[PDB]
Amino acid sequence: VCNTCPEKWINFQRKCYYFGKGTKQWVHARYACDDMEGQLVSIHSPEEQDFLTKHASHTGSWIGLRNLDEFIWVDGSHVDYSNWAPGEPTSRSQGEDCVMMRGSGRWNDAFCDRKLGAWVCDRLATC
Template structure:
């Protein structure tokens, strides 16, 4: 026991214990903060490395793309330079050709002037020749027309004369009683005339000349009886007769120049 009146100092153990606890807490807190900072630093470092890697890959891709573009540009530039050289050479060739064409144009112009002068002279001569040729053509046409008209008139007169002779011969034979033998073979007798019905297809002008070769002419029809006889013996398809408008279109006459008295 302590004597009365003795002052006992306060105990400090509890305070020491509290301070130790606080220090431990502070140390733990510092350790946690350091660990957190270290973790943050590690994360930041990892993210930074990842970002740097991505940036590096992107940079590599960009460098590769730029390198390809540069190569393409260089190749295009070389091609353009070669094209420019070819164009320059072509331009020089064109200029040389242009000079040649200018000299040729001057020569052609001179030749054209000479040709125009010659054409003028030829035209003047052609006008005279044309006039003379027109005169000659008119003379030839006149001669031909006269020759054709005379030939046609002579042919018609000859055919008419042959027909008259045939009629007279038939009349003479009939007067002697030998009318049954008056027509040639393959010809038919009807009303003092002999008729031949041709075979095969012909044009009208061919039929006319065939009759002339047979010493006859295309038939002229002057009665219903004669038409009935012809309809009975003619070709079933079609046949030519001697009605024509050769001298004037629309004005029909018979080949023997007999009047059109029956239609």
């Protein structure tokens, strides 16, 4: 059984999630996750998305998705499952390289220096 979570983290399947609060730019949230032995959340299934939507802040949260050159998760994994809001991401939005999750759970690309009140970390559950 792999459902062991560190204190303050919530289990879902083989992963642990941390629903962070506090005003952060994308890179500030990326390091807040790293310093807690986690990473900004990577989403790989509609079941995982549904669980996140249920615990997510109504005012928007940073997720581990970013445009490098192609959108890639901070942990290195490529996008299989996606939950972009209609029309997203837009090709012509130069500089809107980071991804936030709305209260609905749908994804929007955004300027990296935008300050959001929430961010979500993930890590593997222990046994």
